[PDB]
Amino acid sequence: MISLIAALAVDRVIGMENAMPWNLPADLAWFKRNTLNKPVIMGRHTWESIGRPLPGRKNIILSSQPGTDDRVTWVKSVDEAIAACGDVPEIMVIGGGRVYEQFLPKAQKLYLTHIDAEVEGDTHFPDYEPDDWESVFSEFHDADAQNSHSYCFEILERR
Amino acid sequence: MISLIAALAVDRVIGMENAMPWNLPADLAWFKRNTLNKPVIMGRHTWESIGRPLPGRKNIILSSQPGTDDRVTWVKSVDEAIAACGDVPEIMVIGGGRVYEQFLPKAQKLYLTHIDAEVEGDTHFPDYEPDDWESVFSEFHDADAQNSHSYCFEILERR
Ligand SMILES: CN(Cc1cnc2nc(N)nc(N)c2n1)c1ccc(C(=O)N[C@H](CCC(=O)O)C(=O)O)cc1
Ligand SMILES: CN(Cc1cnc2nc(N)nc(N)c2n1)c1ccc(C(=O)N[C@H](CCC(=O)O)C(=O)O)cc1
Ligand SMILES: [Ca+2]
Ligand SMILES: [Cl-]
Ligand SMILES: [Cl-]
């Protein structure tokens, strides 16, 4: 199946012109746990913001552009990115907006990190109706010595 | 000599207990370049927010309560914080709040990272006297795909 994993501030904001104003190591840890040893599909701009390949995962970059780095697979079709993942039980789509927009219909699972940050965005996660999705997990956490914002982990599955 | 290093938000607001609402890798590089191979003095809260002993630095924790880990030196006083540093050219006082206050009078150097981030806070960096502190270095930077905020690097010699 196709699963989308995302971090969303208030108003489904997922992006800004600059790096997001939150230091959330727990979320990076949650990200990693849920993507490890699975192929991950991202857009050329998420790839650029990470600056390196995500270890122990199959990095696939979707963009109609001539690939820059040799250490990853570059593709230019939703369908093509899928083929590149081959025979795996779950493909993890990591963003951003347009990449989410393209796999959402295909997605059968959502890994969301709800962050209590009121910020003006550039990109948002597309709307998904609360009745085609079943929340099978929820876990709220307060901001702490290592995390700047409160946050809630959640996983929804298609009804 | 004693130097203090701090990342300040607008209003001289500094971190109290939870992590600050920003993401600035460049300031951690700055912090690392200026503290590496030197003893560092910090209070308890900064210690829990770091999570472990900073590599290549002698970690001295100034607290009144019982030492948690053992990779680090724990002290009950400012005068003891010094002795533990032995005689080094520079000792870096890394925060927060209280530790900054107990040392500014003995300070000759300040390494400030002014971040344009309005954070509500109870704690503020001590009031540094203008005509008692001369500016030697100012380096402004714009926010990027990796740094959430615009920031400035500064150095003041007590004169
Ligand atoms: C921009 N970026 C994209 C990003 C970030 N957080 C997210 N968080 C969630 N919930 N979902 C996403 N799709 C997501 N994407 C990044 C940045 C750093 C790392 C990374 O180095 N962090 C951990 C490891 C933690 C660390 O060593 O700092 C990893 O292996 O993924 C990953 C993705
Ligand atoms: C909470 N914390 C205290 C903190 C943070 N930034 C500061 N920044 C400045 N300018 N000054 C301080 N006193 C300061 N203190 C931290 C947290 C992490 C690291 C750190 O983990 N490693 C850095 C380098 C960054 C990295 O390893 O990725 C290092 O000093 O080696 C340092 C300080
Ligand atoms: Ca249930
Ligand atoms: Cl992208
Ligand atoms: Cl403390």
Curated annotation (Swiss-Prot), chains A, B:
Changing residue 154 to Q: In strain: 1810. Keywords: Antibiotic resistance, Methotrexate resistance, NADP, One-carbon metabolism, Oxidoreductase, Trimethoprim resistance. Substrate binds at residues 5, 27, 52, 57, 113. CDD domains: DHFR. Changing residue 154 to K: In strain: B[MB1428]. One of its GO terms (cellular component) is cytosol. Changing residue 28 to R: In strain: B[RT500] isozyme 2. Pathway: Cofactor biosynthesis; tetrahydrofolate biosynthesis; 5,6,7,8-tetrahydrofolate from 7,8-dihydrofolate: step 1/1. NADP(+) binds at residues 7, 13-19, 45-46, 63-64, 76, 95-102. GO terms for molecular function: dihydrofolate reductase activity; dihydrofolic acid binding; folic acid binding; methotrexate binding; NADP binding; NADP+ binding; NADPH binding. Its EC number is 1.5.1.3. Residues 1-158 form the DHFR domain. It is an enzyme of class 1 (oxidoreductase). It catalyses: (6S)-5,6,7,8-tetrahydrofolate + NADP(+) = 7,8-dihydrofolate + NADPH + H(+). Key enzyme in folate metabolism. Catalyzes an essential reaction for de novo glycine and purine synthesis, and for DNA precursor synthesis. The strain K12 sequence is shown. Belongs to the dihydrofolate reductase family. This is Dihydrofolate reductase. It comes from Escherichia coli (strain K12).
